[PDB]
Design a protein around this ligand. Structure first.
Ligand SMILES: [Mn+2]
Ligand SMILES: [Mn+2]
Ligand SMILES: [Mn+2]
Ligand SMILES: [Mn+2]
Lengths: 288, 289, 289, 288
């Protein structure tokens, strides 16, 4: 299987010079660099082409993660918002095709972070989202991209909190390039069973994010990595595994991920590089 | 050890007929019933006396949990709010004295739930809180009440997220009746180690809340119960253990605890009672040495 | 729906006892099953066999049987006279079980136990002879309404079948109705890469399960992953029973055969043994579902 | 922390050309090679000096493991056996001094493997053993060697089966160079708690042997490695950690360790090297 890491582990904002990280992760030994979709729309066609060139030259495959804004909310009861959202994903997805990216993941059926202050209509948001996703799925399938729906803990979203809910949603969407995406941090909170949640996702599991219970890099925390590896083997998983560690305070990243203490224990860039590399060796060894 | 359960496991609002719950948990075998503070400021003297007599007659000890409102935020930069907050706690602690309750717990150094939309000033809030808590602690002590500060996960508060931070805050407060309160649900998210967090709390641990990772009753989930019992034995834990399971959608409870699916799997009241009793048996067997 | 039992040897230091005494004790503690040692059963008159069965019936207890074969009962032996004695022994034993109304026997029935590990080992040869011999005996077991369960043991106690995968390979090769795999948490704990995985491997072939902590204490306060076990039993849709086999006392043949060299019971008298067994029974019913 | 591996992981008899293993292990990155004591009495001083020089040239530290024969049983009720046994360790410890080995471990208070058919007099053997070990320890101190007493599961010995018993025995011996040695494979069977057993050994813990529940290399099994690293940190462990994996059938090793199936799943020497190396990276990452 292929292993990657989210560029945001080193950055405090939802964008960066991605070429810098492609080179970095290739040197550390990663197969994949995951990047935030946010800055992509603002790319000239030329920038898109070189980023793609940088990735090919360094033997790195690029995956994309996205936290939709409120106006990109496919579940919205406001038809103008669903309208804008579909337009947004259609454009983004064509860009991904030109960028040669074949996977996008996140709360793509809703938005993130969300305003939990508003009233919640789970039944109606669910129905609309299923319809909207099915439509965007035609475009994703046209652009050769898997549209991966991240199962999130209750504090970040109310629509899909367990692998079972994820599978139910995707089965309802009933379209080719829509997949369930599990994350060890979120599973850690909502699942009765980690290996059980993965077995439940089975063939709908299109992507996996990793991180310790409190988001440190994989390995020295309490996540049941051996159990996860066995469950991936049981479902014959052949997708990739991207670590999404967040250990630094500050910026929009620190605020959105809610890092209110220095979990990194003052690590500098070199120290962060070394821990990601050690987590990488650890992940290839235990998860495969 | 004494074992209890939060009445909210059966209810969707932050108040209820607590006498009904004292009778229920007594029959199920519990030593303690935790109740929400929310309605207590509106109890008349005889209602307080009746609640206290109900608990005594059923051999049940009452503990109190509270989620402070923004207007009760002891860490507020606004002096008027801190002033209102202290007046609120002073009245509440005196009611707790009348009720023969000796333990209050929750995010008492802050408020809950929190509007995470506002700008966060952790340093100033922390400093203000320590000072406010020091004086409320004095009232609590005079009332014979241990003032327990709950360590919460990052999604619910930003001041105190780990056992180490709670020890840091409580050592700064430096009042014997102010203690750290750990909760398996919250530790499950933030801690590098569960037994480790408990050993770090040590002599400062004044109360423990239990629940599975997704807040089901203790026992069939992934929380490391045996490791918790060993750690409690390592620190000589003298306090009590109260389960806080939340498995039902609806109402303010459902919305504040964010239960967005029927975790109880269609359980009626009798089914809820039976699972709590099995969790009680489990907790006594596994957590005690 | 799942039935739970306990091996009478938990209270005794020799491989036999007044089983009627244990049927009554165990019925009072709440178990569904009492597991008894086969050893004394051939010495029983027809009458005592009928009254043991009436006792079990009168107390609502189901009897299961465990057996450690002697070297002369070794169905895998390269000596044809031993295989012949072995088959005769099991044919007589199985008919007696049919009369006692027991429908399950388990142990290292494909070999013998304890075994003399000083002899040179011929695993391949013993393996082939055993499959053939078990297939034969299976015909009598089927005729007697008895499931012939082959216990998977750790490397220190046997060399033929040490993992759930080897047990399944053996049982599929025997290829006969009433022959099942029997797993034991104490044994799996040593040899398996995965406990849940071993159970899922055994699957439809799992005909019986023995429980005990890593060092053979009653289930619950040890390191065995009980929740994972319960999840795996549900995954396969297990319809059999679960018998705990704790051994915590030094002394006698049981003490040396089970190799208890320290007082694991920590001074427990009979009443304390009963209480711990009952607490483990409540734990097992709750967690294993 | 220094990490090693027992040469027997690649061999089926209790001897081998240790220079070959010193070179192999140094190349794989270990700090220590553990070797069996049994062929050492057959070495000339010239062989000892060249083994010592080879170890030194490759930057490898040597530790020794010994399974005493019934004739080397310091717990024997037979005074002659006790006398011979003491003579055997005196000579051995002198050889280790010559080899610059500072640690020997195993069932040094008894013998291994054990004849279990014999009558067992635990109380008697224990007292004789405490008396004998105390004497040998004066030689061990003179030779600069830590005499480490391995806590074993019940199937391998009856004298010391838990860390508490190990601590009791060493406290009663009351001598400077005697330590308790724990082993994850043995603890996995007898202990109520792994971290608890390590904290119980505390300052008496002089060495740690690692291996999964079924003796595979550390990492992909069920041993609670993070908990072990936590407990080693709690007691401020300054010793070394040597893995003792056994995944091969055949020979005296196969027979004594009771490997009755091919646990290596057809591994060739290079595959065994690779797995040892991944288990080494894992151990350094997770246990420190
Ligand atoms: Mn994620
Ligand atoms: Mn709580
Ligand atoms: Mn058994
Ligand atoms: Mn060892």
């Amino acid at each position: 299987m292929k292993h990657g890491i989210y560029y945001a582990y080193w950055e405090q904002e939802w964008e960066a010079d991605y070429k810098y990280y492609i080179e970095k992760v290739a040197k550390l030994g990663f197969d994949i660099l995951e990047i935030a979709a946010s800055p992509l729309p603002f790319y000239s066609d030329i920038q898109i082409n070189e980023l793609k060139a940088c990735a090919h030259g360094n033997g790195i495959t690029l995956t994309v993660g996205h936290g939709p804004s409120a106006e990109q909310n496919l579940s919205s009861p406001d038809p103008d918002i669903r309208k804008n959202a579909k337009a947004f994903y259609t454009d983004l997805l064509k860009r991904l095709y030109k960028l040669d990216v074949h996977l996008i993941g996140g709360a793509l059926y809703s938005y993130w972070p969300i305003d939990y202050t508003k009233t919640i209509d789970k039944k109606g948001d669910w129905e609309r989202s299923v319809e909207s996703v099915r439509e965007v799925a035609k475009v994703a399938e046209a652009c050769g991209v898997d549209f991966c729906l991240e199962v999130l803990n209750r504090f970040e979203n109310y629509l899909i909190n367990t692998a079972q809910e994820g599978v139910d949603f995707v089965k309802q969407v009933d379209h080719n390039n829509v997949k369930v995406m599990l994350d060890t941090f979120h599973m850690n909170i909502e699942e009765d069973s980690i290996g059980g949640a993965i077995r439940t996702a089975g063939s709908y599991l299109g992507h996996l994010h990793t991180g310790e219970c409190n988001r440190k890099v994989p390995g020295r925390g309490r996540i049941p990595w051996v159990e996860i590896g066995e469950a991936l083997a049981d479902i014959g998983y052949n997708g990739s595994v991207v670590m999404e560690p967040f250990v630094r305070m500050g910026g929009t990243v620190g605020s959105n991920i809610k890092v209110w203490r220095d979990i990194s224990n003052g690590a500098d860039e070199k120290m962060l590089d070394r821990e990601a590399q050690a987590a990488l060796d650890f992940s290839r060894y235990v998860l495969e």
